DNA sequence: TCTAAGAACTCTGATGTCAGTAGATTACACT
DNA sequence: GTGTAATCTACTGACATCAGAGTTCTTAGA
């Protein structure tokens, strides 16, 4: 779907931007409807989400008597759904605005954390945005610098951070946006490190077997002078076996 | 240590008047310092690890509470999982009026004996049933000679604390700005594992730091079928996984009691409490209705058994970084199955890094899940930071899209900028250069949520409202950058906006 | 050993103090 | 005692012995509650520095001085509460409260108290019911009959007063300001008098300071009037204020 | 002159997972 | 039969995760 916005490198300077999702892990359109075994009609079942207090089946009314709580150590504390909205972190706008820049080195492969990828484009028929954003990303093509950006799709939805990573194709400049972790989304564990090999020996004959495996079972064959290999198994062109 | 063992931690304050009511300044107070510490590590442990155990104890007080070895000690709190009412018990003793509130109750300055105090805490840890991974005592006394005037009193303590260390309970210390001096080399030299003002360690107990901390655990274990026959066991571990506000527990209004959501299915016509066998699943297509059982909507979507099949090898450059599916997971060996398979995995790791290569695999995390396709990129450890392992060695599972995932995006063509329009940009970009680090940001919502939750929970006068770090600090962006937005406004587009 | 391991929450690696953009 | 039974209390703090507060209440049978639900009458707290103030933020309930549950012990004080939930399904509680509350927020079906009345009052904007002329006289007559026009801060309410701060009677700047009469006009207004800057026919009283220069002229002018003002010393107002009661004029005449 | 079909995001609820605990089943065994 | 092993299979806390359902916005719109 289209989304209109304003890419903002500093308080005065805004450019028109309109991004599109590009990879999304895709799900089937029609859900499995629920149907009676003998009538085959999709409305002969009503789903009563009834409630119980455990003092011999006192049945509650959700519209009067049920209040959400959170949990705080060894005990429960009652909020109100209507007092969380009084105290909740509210974003001041449907924002997109750059925080600063830094090398490809600051951003290793592993950490990428997103539900989706955006492709983040100059607004339709804005020829001022077209020159300005082509300047932006052409000025990132050569420094190995990347952007870091606050984002938010819309009001009430969570604020968001991460890496707006540029790339180039002969017909358009790429600058994808991807989410990166906050400090509590990142897990640090000292996995017992494997170069201490004295109890798990990698001997000369084992190494001299593997040396031929990983060349021998190559998919990519060098049948070319473009320095692009045959791409013998183009997995991104295969259709999803789940839907087939 | 092993997975299940709780951290368990007991706080043990000197109630003696000579420190308790004492200051050189007016601006702090050692008891008001220790109690603040105990409330603040305890409010950290509540958000972060409700599973781990705290206790708190006053020694040398005049009215007593102990199991045995009673004289002049009061266990304010035995070992328990932490929560609000315990933080409310410590709050009562804080401050200028607090140092009188404590006096109406347990009484101050009397004689004490560390060999009995260490006895008491020992009995405490004994009395609890849970498996404990770390057993730690924290000393909040300033009394640097702990009144070892009788050396034959003091040798009891030193032997008893030999016995603490011998039983694999640990003990730890903080010194608390005693007037004129404190020196560990006089005494405490052998109780802990040149001269001090006040501990550089103690500020770390005031970090108030919040996250869940969830220990190293597998996601699952799988067999990397190289073909029809050769297999190695590997683990699958979650190095990066988005946290969520914890699931809310629905309550009864009138008593705050938890209540059961107790759902059933009921026939729209009749009293039938329909059992799961009474009803099928279905679709509509082409104005006809397709009918399948509650067994087969999940016999469809089967292909394989839990494992990882090898599919052959690629160049690392052809794995294009623009198409990315879901967060990358780690792969690491597990001798728990397939013993000695670590010998194969390690050679595979070592030699892929020479070949500049990835392995391609097909991946099923469970029975009744479709295979995805995954590139095993090989990995190498930066121990150079004095063996702070920023990166574990193994493989990354990086997932690859299929055709359906790569959504169509509209037509556009342009190659528009001149070398001056890039040239001015190459300046602003180099003026705005910082260093990102992965841990340099925090979630504005989830951090705010805990502060709201504490205000409600400990009954605080205000939500702490601590302002987030994701907003650009726009006045610094005005000044560091300077006026150069005008280079776009003049050199690049007309004055009409 | 001591150098990287937090005193509030042992075995786990010390949480550094949030950072953010500053040039 | 058999009085505090049927009245439910929360002793949310003390420190006076907190656990003995509810024990004293228990021989008066006051219904002790550890945590105030929407049922309870009121909440009692020996100090409010932290533990109470969720109940300042949630305007919920009636909060009471320590002594009110050591002075309930010589009275019978018993006064209400809340939870929170806002709802617009097909909205339901507000239309039930069109049966069950006065429109402004005072629930018909439950008593409402210090913090809850302050909140209602802060929501209001101006009107008058009955005719304004009917209402003014209902209030005036009642305070006149029962001498509550003598209420301490209102005790001169039914006095229209002129004050001798003018070197020429009724010329609005022959103004003798700097006079301790300025302070007696503050004292009269502080106790409800309709202090005035013209000696028109609406006046009941003239007040005289140290300067008696114009008393012959007030007396001579007062020969004109259809309803005749009293002339009184400064001390009538001083004494009536000190005694918290109208001392009456005829010993203070001229 | 506007009324649903198509998005989009968050949240809730079940299913499956792992580690660890401990019970009952069930094997082994008596000259 | 009677009695003592050894050891399989359960249940729970806890953590991830797909699906499914509640909710605000664009285009096509009488």
Which strands make up the sheet holding D160-163, listed edge to edge?
D194-195, D160-163, D205-208, D230-233
B321 and B297 both lie in a single domain: no
- B40 CB contact with strand E at below 7 Å: no
Give domain status of residue B292, yes or no. yes
B462 and B344 both lie in a single domain: no
For A208, the enclosing helix (H) or strand (E) is helix A204-216
Candidates B185, B178, B50, B164; CA nearest to B116 is B164
Decide if D34 contacts D45 (C-beta within 8 A).
no
Decide if B319 contacts B313 (C-beta within 8 A).
no
> Considering B386, B402, B418, which residue would you say is the last residue of a domain?
B402
Q: What is the CATH number of the domain that holds B246?
A: 4.10.970.10
Give domain status of residue B191, yes or no. yes
- Judging by beta carbons within 10 Å of its beta carbon (0-12, 13-18, 19+), is residue B198 exposed, middle or buried? middle
Whether B460 and D53 lie within 8 Å, measured CB to CB = yes
- Judging by beta carbons within 10 Å of its beta carbon (0-12, 13-18, 19+), is residue A167 exposed, middle or buried? middle
Report the chain B residue with the minimal C-alpha distance to residue C5. B388
Give domain status of residue B163, yes or no. yes
Residue pairs between chains A and C whose CB atoms are closer than 8 Å: 9
Task: Tell me how far apart the alpha carbons of residues B82 and B59 are, in angstroms, rounded to a whole number.
Answer: 21
According to the entry, how was the structure determined? cryo-EM
- Parallel, antiparallel or unpaired: strands D63-64 and D31-33: unpaired
- A165 CB contact with strand E at below 7 Å: no
Candidates B355, A165, B318, A109; CA nearest to B347 is B355
In chain B, how many domains are there?
Answer: 4
Task: Tell me how far apart the alpha carbons of residues A50 and A34 are, in angstroms, rounded to a whole number.
Answer: 19
Residues of B acting as catalytic residues: 2
Decide if B482 contacts A12 (C-beta within 8 A).
no
Nucleotide nearest to B212 (CA to C1'): F15
Give domain status of residue B103, yes or no. yes
In Å, what is the separation between the CA of D223 and the C1' of F26? 87
Query: Would you put residue A119 in left (φ > 0), alpha (ψ -120 to 50) or beta?
Result: beta
Candidates B211, B7, B3, B171; CA nearest to C9 is B7
Beta bridge partners of D28: none
Largest CA distance in chain D: 78
Task: Tell me how far apart the alpha carbons of residues B298 and D123 are, in angstroms, rounded to a whole number.
Answer: 59
Give domain status of residue B62, yes or no. yes
Q: Which of residues 20-59 of A touch strand E (CB under 7 A)?
A: 21, 24, 29, 49
Return the sign of the alpha-carbon dihedral for residues B64, B68, B72, B74: negative
> Considering B402, B430, B461, which residue would you say is the last residue of a domain?
B402
B386 and B416 both lie in a single domain: no
List chain A residues with CB under 8 Å of D96: none
Q: What is the CATH number of the domain that holds B467?
A: 1.10.1600.10
Q: What are phi and psi of B445, to 5 degrees?
A: -70, -60
Task: Tell me how far apart the alpha carbons of residues B302 and B83 are, in angstroms, rounded to a whole number.
Answer: 45
Decide if B23 contacts B29 (C-beta within 8 A).
yes
Give domain status of residue B1, yes or no. no
> Considering B285, B304, B323, which residue would you say is the last residue of a domain?
B304
Task: Tell me how far apart the alpha carbons of residues A198 and B446 are, in angstroms, rounded to a whole number.
Answer: 45
Whether A109 and B425 lie within 8 Å, measured CB to CB = no
User: In the structure encoding, which two tokens stand for residue A109, read together?
Assistant: 């492969």
B280 and B343 both lie in a single domain: no
B57 and B167 both lie in a single domain: yes
Beta bridge partners of A167: A174
Q: What are phi and psi of A220, to 5 degrees?
A: -70, 115
Give domain status of residue B300, yes or no. yes
| Cα–Cα separations (whole angstroms), residue B491 to B197, B481, B496 | 60, 17, 14
Decide if B202 contacts B174 (C-beta within 8 A).
yes
List chain D residues with CB under 8 Å of A63: 87, 89, 92
Decide: helix, strand or coil at residue D182.
Answer: helix
Give domain status of residue B482, yes or no. yes
Q: What is the CATH number of the domain that holds B132?
A: 3.40.50.410
B363 and B423 both lie in a single domain: no
Decide: helix, strand or coil at residue A51.
Answer: strand
- Parallel, antiparallel or unpaired: strands D205-208 and D230-233: parallel
Return the sign of the alpha-carbon dihedral for residues D230, D235, D239, D244: positive
Whether B388 and C4 lie within 8 Å, measured CB to CB = yes
Whether B261 and A49 lie within 8 Å, measured CB to CB = yes
B246 and B235 both lie in a single domain: no
At how many Å resolution was this determined?
A: 8.9
B31 and B130 both lie in a single domain: yes
List chain B residues with CB under 8 Å of D83: 253
Radius of gyration of chain D (CA): 27
B276 and B360 both lie in a single domain: no
What are the start-end ranges of the E strands in A104-203? 116-122, 145-151, 160-169, 172-179
Instruction: Give per-residue burial for A87-109: e unless 16+ CB within 10 Å, then b.
Output: bebebeebbbbbbbbbeeebbee
Candidates B446, B46, B245; CA nearest to A72 is B46
The one-character DSSP state at D245 is S
Range of the domain at B270: 242-304
A102 touches C at CB < 8 Å: no
Task: Count the neighbouring beta carbons within 10 Å of the beta carbon of residue B153.
Answer: 14
Q: Which chains touch D (3 or more CB pairs under 8 A)?
A: A, B
Decide if A183 contacts B442 (C-beta within 8 A).
yes
Query: Among partner residues B44, B388, B432, which is closest to C8 by beta-carbon distance?
Result: B44
Decide if B371 contacts B345 (C-beta within 8 A).
no
B29 and B90 both lie in a single domain: yes
Whether A82 and D92 lie within 8 Å, measured CB to CB = no
B181 and B46 both lie in a single domain: yes
Report the chain B residue with the minimal C-alpha distance to residue C13. B388
Q: What is the CATH number of the domain that holds B382?
A: 2.40.290.10
B202 and B259 both lie in a single domain: no
SS (H, E, C) chain B: CCCCCEEEEEEEEECCHHHHCCCCCCCCCHHHHHHHHHHHHHHHHHHHCCCCEEEEEEECCCCCECCCCCCCEEEEEEEECCEHHHHHHHHCCCCCCHHHHCCCCCCCCCCCCHHHHHHHHHHHHHHCCCCEEEEEEEEECCCCCCCCCCHHHHHHHHHHHHHHHHCCCEEEEECCCCCCCCCCCCCCCCCCCCCCCCCCCHHHHHCCCCCCCCCCCCCEEEEEECCCCCCCEEEEECCECCCCCCCCEEEECCCCCECEECCCCEECCCCCECCHHHECEEEEECCEEEEECCCCCCCCCCCCCCEEEEEEEEECCCCCCCCCCCCCEEEEECCCCCCCCHHHHHHHHHHHHHHCEEEEEEEECCCCCCCEEEEEEEECCCCCCCCCCCCCCEEEEEECCCHHHECCCCCCCCCCCCHHHHHHHHHHHHHCECCCCCCCCCCHHHHHHHHHHHHHHCCCCCCCCCCCCCCCCHHHHHHHHCCCHHHHHHHCCCCCC
């Amino acid at each position: 779907i289209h989304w209109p916005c304003r890419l903002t490198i500093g308080s005065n300077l805004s450019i028109r931007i309109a991004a599109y999702k590009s990879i999304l892990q895709e799900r089937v359109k029609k859900t499995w409807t629920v149907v009676d075994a003998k009538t085959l009609k999709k409305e002969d079942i009503q789903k009563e989400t009834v409630y119980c207090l455990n003092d011999d089946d006192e049945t509650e009314v959700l519209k009067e008597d049920i209040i959400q709580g959170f949990r705080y150590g060894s005990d429960i504390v009652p909020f109100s759904k209507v007092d969380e909205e009084q105290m909740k972190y509210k974003s001041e706008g449907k924002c997109f605005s750059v925080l600063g820049f830094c090398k490809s080195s600051q951003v290793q492969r592993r950490f990428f954390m997103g539900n989706q990828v955006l492709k983040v484009f100059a607004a339709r028929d804005d020829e001022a945005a077209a020159v300005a954003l082509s300047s932006l990303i052409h000025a990132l093509d050569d420094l190995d610098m990347v952007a870091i950006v606050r984002y938010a799709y819309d009001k009430r939805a969570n604020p968001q951070v991460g890496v707006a990573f540029p790339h180039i194709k002969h017909n358009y400049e790429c600058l994808v946006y991807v989410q990166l972790p906050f400090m509590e989304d990142l897990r640090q564990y000292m996995f017992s490190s494997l170069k201490n090999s004295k109890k798990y020996a990698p001997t000369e004959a084992q190494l001299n077997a593997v040396d031929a495996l990983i060349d021998s079972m190559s998919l990519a064959k060098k049948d070319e002078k473009t320095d692009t290999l045959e791409d013998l198994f183009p997995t991104t062109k295969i259709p999803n076996p789940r839907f087939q | 240590y092993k997975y299940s063992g709780r951290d368990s931690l007991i706080f043990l304050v000197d109630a003696s008047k000579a420190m308790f009511e004492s200051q050189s300044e007016d601006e702090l107070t050692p008891f008001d310092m220790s109690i603040q510490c105990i409330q603040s590590v305890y409010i950290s442990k509540i958000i972060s690890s409700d599973r781990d155990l705290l206790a708190v104890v006053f020694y040398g007080t005049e009215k007593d509470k102990n199991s045995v070895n009673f004289k002049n000690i009061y266990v304010l709190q035995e070992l328990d999982n932490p929560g609000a009412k315990r933080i409310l018990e410590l709050d009562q003793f804080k401050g200028q009026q607090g140092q009188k509130r404590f006096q109406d109750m347990m009484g101050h300055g009397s004689d004490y004996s560390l060999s009995e105090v260490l006895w008491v805490c020992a009995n405490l840890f004994s009395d609890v049933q849970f498996k404990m991974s770390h057993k730690r005592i924290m000393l909040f006394t300033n009394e640097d000679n702990p009144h070892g005037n009788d050396s034959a009193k003091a040798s009891r303590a030193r032997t008893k604390a030999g016995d603490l260390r011998d039983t694999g309970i640990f003990l730890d210390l903080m010194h608390l700005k005693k007037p004129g001096g404190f020196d560990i080399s006089l005494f405490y030299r052998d109780i802990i594992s040149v001269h001090f003002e006040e501990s550089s360690k103690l500020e770390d107990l005031l970090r108030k730091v919040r996250a869940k901390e969830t220990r190293k655990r597998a996601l699952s274990r799988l067999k990397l079928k190289l073909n029809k026959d050769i297999v190695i066991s590997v683990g699958i571990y979650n190095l990066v996984q988005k946290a969520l506000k914890p699931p809310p527990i629905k309550l009864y209004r009138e008593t705050n009691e938890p209540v059961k959501t107790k759902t059933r299915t009921f026939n729209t016509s009749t009293g039938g409490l329909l059992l799961p066998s009474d009803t099928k699943r279905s679709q509509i297509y082409g104005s006809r209705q397709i009918i399948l059982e509650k067994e087969e909507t999940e016999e469809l979507k089967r292909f394989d058994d839990p494992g990882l099949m090898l599919m052959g090898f690629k160049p690392l450059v052809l794995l294009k970084k623009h198409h990315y599916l879901r967060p990358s997971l780690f792969v690491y060996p597990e001798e728990s199955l397939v013993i000695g398979s670590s010998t194969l995995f390690s050679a595979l790791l070592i030699k892929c890094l020479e070949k500049e290569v990835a392995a391609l695999c097909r991946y099923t995390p469970r029975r009744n899940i479709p295979p995805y396709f995954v590139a095993l990129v090989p990995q190498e450890e930066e121990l150079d930071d004095q063996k702070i392992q920023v990166t574990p060695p193994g493989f990354q599972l990086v997932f690859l899209p299929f055709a359906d995932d790569k959504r169509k995006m509209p037509f556009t063509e342009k190659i528009m900028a001149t070398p001056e329009q890039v040239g001015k940009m190459k300046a602003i970009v180099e003026k705005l250069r910082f260093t990102y680090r992965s841990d340099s940001f925090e979630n504005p919502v989830l951090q705010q949520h805990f502060r709201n939750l504490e205000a409600l929970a400990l009954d605080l006068m205000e939500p702490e409202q601590a302002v987030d770090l994701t907003l650009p600090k726009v006045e610094a962006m005005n000044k560091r950058l300077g006026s150069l937005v005008d280079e776009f406004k003049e050199l690049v587009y007309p004055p009409d906006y | 050993r001591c150098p990287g391991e937090s005193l509030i929450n042992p075995g786990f690696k010390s949480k550094k103090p949030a950072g953010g953009v500053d040039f | 005692s058999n009085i505090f039974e049927d009245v439910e209390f929360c002793v949310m703090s003390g420190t006076q012995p907190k656990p003995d507060l509810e024990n004293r209440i228990a021989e008066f049978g006051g219904y002790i509650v550890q945590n105030p639900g929407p049922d309870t009458y009121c909440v009692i707290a020996g100090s409010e520095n932290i533990r109470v103030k969720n109940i300042i933020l949630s305007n919920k309930h009636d909060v009471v001085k320590p002594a009110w549950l050591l002075e309930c012990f010589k009275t019978k004080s018993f006064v209400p509460w809340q939870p929170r939930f806002m709802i617009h399904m097909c909205p339901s509680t507000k239309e039930h409260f069109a049966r069950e509350y006065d429109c402004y927020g005072d629930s018909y079906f439950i008593d409402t108290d210090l913090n809850q009345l302050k909140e209602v009052f802060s929501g209001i904007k101006n009107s008058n019911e009955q005719t304004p002329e009917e209402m003014a006289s209902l209030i005036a007559d009642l305070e006149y009959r029962y001498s509550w026009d003598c209420s301490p801060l209102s005790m001169f309410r039914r006095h229209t007063v002129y004050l001798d701060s003018y070197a020429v009677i009724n010329d609005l700047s022959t103004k003798n300001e700097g006079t301790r009469l300025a302070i007696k006009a503050l004292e009269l207004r502080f106790h409800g008098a309709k202090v005035v800057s013209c000696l028109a026919e609406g006046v009941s009283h003239v007040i005289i300071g140290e300067d008696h220069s114009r008393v012959a002229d007030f007396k001579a002018f007062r020969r004109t009037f259809k309803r005749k003002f009293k002339i009184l010393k400064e001390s009538w107002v001083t004494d009536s204020i000190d005694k918290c009661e109208l001392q009456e004029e005829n010993q203070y005449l001229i």
